[PDB]
Structure formats: structure tokens, C-alpha cells
Design a protein around this ligand. Structure first.
Ligand code: FAD
Ligand code: FAD
Ligand code: Y7R
Ligand code: CL
Lengths: 471, 470
């Protein structure tokens, strides 16, 4: 018999997309969210990462567009911007400035609260979706361990009354994010511990919101400075992204060993000590609208429920709860869209439980691309904490992995054919392994390499919008 | 290490597509084929089924088009026809005539030798593909048994010289077809026996090519008769497809228990004893160009190498050899395209040996749709021989499967919304399980049902091109 009631824990991007998908296949869906969901673009404590710069890469943007047609146009009408890569960005890599080749990929950029609200407005309006705001999931009900175990429902607590209730379900979806209590819920059902890979470069983030020079959010590119050209030293990075309302979102980041700004008067000096001070020059006369927001959620971690024999029937885990990545590569929301898309494409085949386990295996395969990309890039940072069994990571020459990464970067910034393939991998539209293919290696040697840029490739009319001259 | 030499055993559609794919990722590929590959459309002993009706459904057509751009345009320029479903077909089901709704899917139809050569011409021209024509693979080399072995190469015979030769390889692809010798090659390295699911309704086929009335191949629909409305006696079917050169391809079919025309003067009598005699009335004044070609390759069979722990490294199996289906549903070439597309999509991720089995598991998952579709439809035929472990087949009440198949068919022929989803499953673009989805059940209840057609839905101008009335 088919499932008739599904419960989705968490109403952020992973839970909202899964709720919309499951409503097409299940008679009734209940969404359990700890926060009150605002009706206007507004931050909330359940998604504290929304304070920092967010790119929706073309992989997630297309997956969301095919699930919810019109979403992209609604975002743009609300002030979001479609950044073309590498065309609409002034980017400094460890190998030099990126030539602004005609765009081969894109990313939608906006405030994360606007993007969350726009998606919620297009997904949660179905008649068979019930949203229980200000309701907290406390534990799962059912049985675990041995064989034959299965999750029957979830205990929820109403936060305005304090009363608890048993919410029975044929299917429970954990989408509660990086701070998820899944390991406690599992152990309370007698389920053994899950396998977990971790690659933790100790990345932290400091963000301020600025009023951009008038017109810059439309006629000035995004700027990204990534300083990693030495490997015995921690990485230090910085981005300035345009968002709706004529505002600049500036996010500074560093790996373990470096020092982030903890006060407002340390923000611009950090940008002045990157490999090029262009982010400081842009933000020197810009009006700050916020204090400095911080984040320490920069580890790469992946659970493998698809490997656990004692995985209970009727339970799935998606989003940051299943796996989370270093935000610098900006794949979290695309991974959430992949989880919902995989449920949509595999649900009917997986029912008629071999279905719950088949869905979880399909979900695990869909999140491999953002995992192996972020972990490959972070594993070689100095003082990185590594605890993973992935043979693509652990059994690899460390000199050769670094040298090859440098060669990939050197080709992408100055070779059109190499840049196109790299943006495919960067946009999560091609696996990381494609950079080791015969196709990429032949493109890397055969393609032309343009001369090295000795200054940031701003067009003069872009410098005129922000009131600068000669880089 | 990244494979530097791959060998594909067998040409035809599975081998040709896989060879084109592997050439993108491996330095050199060898294609070893028993027959001489002709440079113009001609049948051959290695693919004797090419004499029978062949539809390239949109699933395989799109996968081939994305692999080999321009192939669809060359086929149409060479005389192939893009039949829209259900618009361009007059089809009689066990529930009645199919309303010719605007096309929601399509299939390319032409002679199989023409389609084969067109794909060969656009796939095997790469500089790093070497074709060993008139060369036969006899056995595999390597190790097997115990811990799980590994494949080193293949022994080949040159047929114009008579010489044997050892061809080592980092990766061997079996694309030999339904009569493939893989299970003996396995035992020859001591690899345990593979799991196999079989649903064999004993389907046989008789085909005669006719010269169609001038213009019929372009302005007249294909006709498909499925005489299937009783479950206690064998099914008998018949189709007439247009192909290039102004010719009609007529393929007659039956399941175990019935008798096909095995003599030429019984061919049209078989067509007049279908549930409607329209295919006989079409073929009585038609000029016969061939004798009747026969085939008894109508069983559904699936190997499960993805389940065998001791599967040797460096070996993959694709096409009809891995799994074959009842031709009546026409998914074999689309399944061959799926295996090649899956190899292309997963190859780089699978290397960087865990790769060969990762590729084989991905290939096995891609061939599930045509297997469960053909097996679900064939399992309940009278005197059908079943040897399978698939719980989607074994643990099903047969009344519930029979009743639902009738409701799916009755909805598809007279409800537009239901027809759209059914053609998606029929064209192999949606899994069979979609017909049990809440989405499909809601479409069946909510959508209108048009009145029953009491006559074949020919337009008056279509009857006039073939010279009939009513
Ligand atoms: C600094 C930073 C920058 C990032 N930048 C990007 C970027 O540029 N691009 C990108 O794609 N991704 C980015 N990410 C990742 C992205 O924010 C997440 O991947 C995305 O939010 C998906 O997470 P999720 O929906 O699974 O969980 P979350 O977004 O964390 O949401 C979890 C939800 O569950 C709720 N919840 C928690 N516990 C309970 C409970 N017990 N009961 C009920 N509800 C509960 C919470 O209130 C919340 O609504 C970034 C992350 C960080 C930290
Ligand atoms: C009557 C009938 C009708 C069909 N109709 C359709 C249809 O409408 N649509 C559709 O999509 N499919 C149809 N099929 C299925 C389709 O023919 C096959 O699925 C398709 O050809 C894929 O098979 P293959 O390439 O894997 O193997 P095959 O096409 O059988 O090719 C195997 C090749 O390997 C070669 N070979 C074999 N052994 C050796 C050896 N030892 N050494 C060297 N070379 C060797 C052979 O010479 C041959 O060239 C039909 C099949 C039949 C029987
Ligand atoms: C040197 C290196 O890291 O190579 C990869 C660099 C990339 C992929 C560009 C850097 C991207 C960012 C800093 C994103 C902005 C920050 C957040 C979304 C939190
Ligand atoms: Cl955060």
C-alpha cells in the first residue's frame, strides 16, 4: 500500500521544496516548522545563515524553475539579479584575474529572505499541504535496530501552548538543517550510529550590509577576491554581491588560523589585506546598514544513511541535515533542490520498505557532486581537520592534487574553452571528476591562453558608477 | 588508473552508441564485429531482426539525438517518418479504438538497416575508434571466482584469415545481443552464475514488406491492431508501418498457443481474423516485395550483474545481452541508448575497481523501465512461462493487475489527460509505476471521456489515398 500522509520537518529551502514535491504524490502533507514564517522578506532565527551572501547557482535555479515555473521571473521582478559567470564578475584567483568571457553559466543573487519567501509563496499554497508554524519536532516514534524497524510518526511540541502531541505519519522527512537532532532521534529508536565523512577547514564568515552607490547593483559587477596562492597559510577571501533594494552584501571569510573582524572597525582593514584591496576601495565610502554578522558553519560533513542496514523504513533526511558544505562554493540550496527533484523523479518507482531505502540511496547519489567539490578544495588547507573514508580524498597524492588544482585555475582564468567546463563544475552542472577527463585535459592544452591581466578587468563605465579610476 | 583501451564486442545499436561514448573518455576503443558492416542499407546475419518492424521511441530518439546531433534530420532526409502518438496512428485496443488526440509523444520509423547505418555513419568516424570488422570474440581473459576476479582482455578470431589473436583491454563491453555467450564466458573464468528474471509469453513474429500505394507513407497513418480483450486465449496482433521508399512494413504477431503464418498464403488470412479486418483490406491489392521473415525472439529476460558480488572488474554488459524485452512494446533500441547515455553520464565520476561495478549498477538502474513495462504486460498471458524474483511481479494479485490494465487502456483511448500520461509511459519517458500514481488516478476520474468510436477513426482523405470507403 502507498503512503497517505507525509510529515516534513523544517520549512526552509529543503523542507519547502520537498513538501511541494510530496504533495503531488501523497494525499496529505504536514510541514512542521519551529519558527513563525513571515509574510514579507524578513530574517528569522531558524535560518541565521540568511545574514550572509547567497548565490543560487544555475543548477538549483533550473531545478527550482522546473518544479515551480515562474519562480525566476518573480525573483527578478522583486529585484534579484541574474549574474553571468564569469562575465558579470571581477574575480581574483590564486593564479590571477579571471578574464570576463561571455557567460556560460549563471547564478541568481538576492537576499536569502526574499528567495525563501518567493519559494514558499510558490510551493506551500497547495490544498493538501498543512503548515504547522511555531511547532517543534521533539522525537520520532516507531521502532529501530535489528531488522524490520520503521518510523511511525513524530512527537511535536506547540511553542505557544507548550503542549505536546503525537503526529502519526507514513513518511517522515528530516529537513531541519545543520543543527538537526537526527542522531539523537535515531539513537532513541535504537538505530546504530551513521557513517560520517568530515572535511573541516575551520571556515568562518563576517558580513555587513551596505547601501551601494546608486545604480551599482545593476551596472556594476559582483567582485570576488580569493587569496589561497600559498598553501602553508590560511585562506582569506571576500565577496561583494548586489541584492535587491540597491544594497551591497559584503561577506568576508577565512580558514583556520586567520583572524576575522569581530568589530565594525576591523571590517574594511580585513578587505585591505587581501591580495588586492579593491573590496576596501569599493566599501570605503559606502554606507553600512548593519553591524558585523558572524557564522562558524563552514565544515563539509556528509551522513551516509544509504549505507546503514538498520535504516528505518518511512524516514528520509535531506538538505543540510543529510549533508552540508563550505558556503564559499555556494551549493547548499542547489543540493536542497536536488533532494526534492530526486524525490519527485523516484517516488512512484520506489513505492511498489525497499522504497524508503531506494529513495535515500537516490538522494545520496544526488548530493555527491557538491560534497566532492567542496571537500576536494578544502582538504589541503593548513590545519584542516579531516575524518573521511572517501578514497577520492584520502588515498591521493597531496602534491599532485594541489598542482593540478592550480593548473585548472590557471587555465580557467585565461582560456575560453577551459573556462566553460570549469564554470559547469563550479555551477554544479558537471561532476568534479570532469576536470580530470580526457576532454578537459585536451581542452586545457589545445585552447589558447590570453595574456595575463595586470589589473582588475573593470570596464571604464563600471568604475564611473562607483566613482573610482585606474583599478 | 584511468582506462586507456576499451573494447566493445558487437556493433549494432548498443555497441555503436557505447563505442562513441567510450571514445570521449578513453584514449582508444576497439569495436570487434563478426559481420562485415555495409556502407549502404542492407540486412546482415548478426542482426536478423532488422527485417521486422522497428520504432525508435522518443526516449531513444532524444538520447541518440543528444549523443549524435543531426541524426534525426539525416533520418528524415533519408525517408524516415516521425509518427506522432496517438495522432498519427489508427489503433484498436481491447477496449476500443484510440481517439487520435494531438500528438504528445513521437517515434521515428524506418527500416532498421537504414537507422543502423545512419547511426554508424555519425558515431564510428572518430579517429580513436578502430573497427575490427569480420572479427569474432570467442572468450574472455582474466580471473574469477573466490574473492571476485578481474577481466584482462578478449580472444578474437579474424574470419577472412582464420587467425586467433589476444586483445588485452582495461575495459570490455559485451554488446553481442540476445544470443550472447556471457554466461559461458563467466563460468569459463569461474564466476558464479548470475541472477536472471524471465517472463516468456512465447511471442513470435511474421513480417512481409509491401510497396505502399503512392503517397500513403506520407499522408496515411500507421495501423496497429491489438486483439487482446480475452485473457483465457492467446493474443494475436498486427501492425503496418510506413518506411522509406514508399513501402509498408507489415509485422504479424502472436503469443504462445496461437499459430503464425509460416507460409505466404496464410499471411493476410491472419490479418482478416484480427478483431477488425482493416489490415487485410489494406494489404490485398498491395504488391509483395519479400517472403515472410520469421522471428521467435519474444521473451523478456534480465540479468542482474549489479547483484553479484564476484562480478569481474573491467567488464560491462549492455543492450539485449544484459536485458531483452517483448518487441511488441518497442523499447530495445531505447534501452541500448540508455546504457550508452548512462556510461557517458557516469564514466568520469566512476573512475577517479569500484568504477566498473558503479557503472554496471547505473546501467542496470537505467534499464528497469522497459523491463517492468514489458514483464507486467506479458506475465498474465495464458501459458506464459515465468522464472523471476521481482516482487513487483510475484506478490501481485492478478485480478488487480488485470482490472487495472483494462482501466488504464479504457482511459487512454478516450480521455486526453489520461492519454498524455499513458503515451509518456508507452514512449519510455515515464516509469510504469506512474500509472499507479495519485496524479494518474486523478486524471482518470476528473477528465472527460469522449464517446466510443464505432469505426476506425480514419479521416475521409486518408481512406481516399489508399482507395477504400467506410
Ligand atoms: C554563511 C553561509 C552562506 C551560505 N551561502 C550559500 C550560497 O551562496 N548558496 C547556497 O546555495 N547555499 C548557501 N549556504 C547554504 C544554505 O544556507 C543551506 O544549504 C540551505 O538553507 C538549505 O538548508 P536546509 O533547508 O536543509 O536547512 P536550513 O536552511 O538550516 O533550515 C532548517 C529549518 O528547520 C527548522 N527546524 C530546525 N529544527 C527544527 C525542529 N526541531 N522542529 C521544527 N523545525 C525545525 C529551522 O527553523 C529552519 O527553518 C550558505 C550557508 C551559510 C551558513
Ligand atoms: C522482432 C523484433 C522486433 C523489434 N522491434 C523493435 C522496435 O520496434 N524498437 C526497438 O527499439 N527495438 C526493437 N527490437 C529490439 C532491438 O532489435 C534490439 O533491442 C537492439 O538491436 C539492441 O540489441 P543489441 O545492439 O544489444 O544487440 P544486437 O542488435 O542483437 O547486435 C549484436 C551484435 O553483436 C554481434 N556479435 C554477436 N556475437 C558476436 C561475437 N562473438 N563476436 C563479434 N560480434 C558478435 C552481432 O553480429 C551483432 O552485430 C526488436 C527486436 C526483435 C527481435
Ligand atoms: C580559492 C578558492 O577558494 O577557490 C574557489 C573560489 C570560489 C569558488 C569563489 C569564492 C566564493 C565565495 C567566497 C562565495 C561567497 C561567500 C559565501 C557565499 C559565504
Ligand atoms: Cl550561520
Amino acid at each position: 500500500t502507498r503512503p497517505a500522509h507525509a510529515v516534513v520537518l523544517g520549512a526552509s529551502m529543503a523542507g519547502t521544496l520537498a513538501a511541494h514535491v510530496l504533495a503531488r504524490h501523497v494525499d496529505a502533507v504536514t510541514v512542521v516548522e519551529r519558527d513563525a514564517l513571515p509574510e514579507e522578506p524578513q530574517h528569522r532565527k531558524g535560518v541565521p545563515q540568511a545574514r550572509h551572501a547567497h548565490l543560487l547557482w544555475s543548477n538549483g535555479a533550473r531545478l527550482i524553475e522546473e518544479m515551480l515555473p515562474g519562480t525566476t521571473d518573480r525573483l527578478l521582478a522583486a529585484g534579484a539579479r541574474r549574474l553571468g559567470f564569469p562575465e558579470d564578475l571581477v574575480t581574483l584567483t590564486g593564479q590571477g584575474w579571471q578574464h570576463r568571457f561571455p557567460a556560460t553559466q549563471f547564478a541568481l543573487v538576492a537576499s536569502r529572505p526574499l528567495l525563501d519567501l518567493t519559494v514558499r509563496q510558490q510551493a506551500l499554497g497547495a490544498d493538501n499541504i498543512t503548515v504547522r508554524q511555531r511547532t517543534e519536532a521533539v522525537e520520532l516514534t516507531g521502532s529501530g535496530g535489528g531488522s524490520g524497524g520503521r518510523v511511525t510518526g513524530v512527537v511535536v511540541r506547540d511553542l505557544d501552548s507548550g503542549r505536546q502531541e503525537q503526529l502519526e505519519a507514513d513518511l517522515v522527512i528530516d529537513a531541519t538543517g545543520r543543527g538537526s537532532r537526527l542522531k539523537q532521534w535515531l539513537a532513541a529508536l535504537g538505530v546504530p550510529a551513521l557513517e560520517e565523512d568530515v572535511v573541516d577547514a575551520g571556515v568562518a564568515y563576517a558580513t555587513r550590509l551596505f547601501k551601494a552607490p546608486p545604480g551599482a547593483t545593476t551596472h556594476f559587477p559582483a567582485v570576488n577576491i580569493a587569496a589561497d596562492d600559498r598553501v602553508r597559510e590560511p585562506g582569506r577571501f571576500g565577496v561583494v554581491y548586489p541584492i535587491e533594494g540597491g544594497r551591497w552584501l559584503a561577506t568576508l571569510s577565512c580558514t583556520r588560523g586567520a583572524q576575522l573582524p569581530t568589530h565594525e572597525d576591523e571590517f574594511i582593514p580585513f578587505a585591505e589585506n587581501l591580495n588586492h584591496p579593491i573590496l576596501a576601495d569599493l566599501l570605503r565610502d559606502a554606507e553600512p546598514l548593519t553591524p558585523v554578522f558572524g557564522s562558524r558553519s563552514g565544515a563539509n560533513r556528509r551522513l551516509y544513511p544509504e549505507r546503514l542496514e538498520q535504516w528505518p523504513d518511512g524516514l528520509l533526511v535531506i538538505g543540510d541535515s543529510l549533508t552540508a558544505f563550505n558556503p564559499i562554493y555556494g551549493h547548499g540550496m542547489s543540493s536542497a533542490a536536488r533532494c526534492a527533484t530526486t524525490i519527485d523523479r523516484e517516488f512512484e518507482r520506489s513505492v511498489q520498505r525497499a522504497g524508503t531505502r531506494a529513495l535515500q540511496k537516490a538522494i545520496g547519489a544526488a548530493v555527491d557532486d557538491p560534497w566532492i567539490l567542496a571537500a576536494t578544495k578544502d582538504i589541503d588547507y593548513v590545519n584542516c581537520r579531516v575524518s573521511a573514508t572517501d578514497p577520492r580524498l584520502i588515498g591521493v597524492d597531496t602534491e599532485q592534487r594541489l598542482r593540478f588544482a592550480e593548473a585548472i585555475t590557471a587555465a580557467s582564468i585565461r582560456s575560453p574553452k577551459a573556462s566553460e567546463i570549469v564554470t559547469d563544475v563550479m555551477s554544479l552542472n558537471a561532476p568534479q571528476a570532469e576536470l580530470g577527463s580526457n576532454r578537459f585535459l585536451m581542452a586545457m592544452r589545445a585552447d589558447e591562453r590570453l595574456p595575463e591581466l595586470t589589473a582588475p578587468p573593470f570596464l571604464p563605465e563600471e568604475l564611473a558608477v562607483v566613482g573610482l579610476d585606474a583599478a
